[PDB]
Structure 1
């Protein structure tokens, strides 16, 4: 219970924070072909394209 409240407060602090979003907009483009051939796994594949979870 306490941790659900604390992660809500973390999303209050950061996450729609203006300058952290302005820091991170379009950095680290990953083609899905590059995601496969370069062998990225997990949260990269979760975060760009393929609906792949073990």
Structure 2
């Protein structure tokens, strides 16, 4: 995180890049971090847990 998180070069390369809306993410069949990055509150370990 020291190398990347607050690095302005890293933020320039990743901030506002590849924005997906919560609605598009659902209809396109996304899952995991691809849903949770857009604010969807979903994780199968919480909602449909296993072992």
TM-score grouping bracket, smaller chain normalisation: 0.7 to 0.9
Paired residues, number: 44
Return the alpha-carbon distance in structure 1 between the equivalents of residues 23 and 9 of structure 2. 31
Structure (1 or 2) with the larger CA radius of gyration: 1
Give CA-to-partner distance per residue, 1:23-54, whole Å, 9 cap, x none.
Answer: 12111111111111100000111111210010
Higher fraction of helix: 1
What RMSD in Å do the two structures reach over aligned CA positions? 1.0
Please give the secondary structure, in 1, of the residue aligned with 2:2.
helix
**TM-score of the superposed pair, with normalisation by structure 2:** 0.74
1:27-42 superposed matches below 5 A? 27-42=17-32
Gaps of 5+ in 2: 45-51
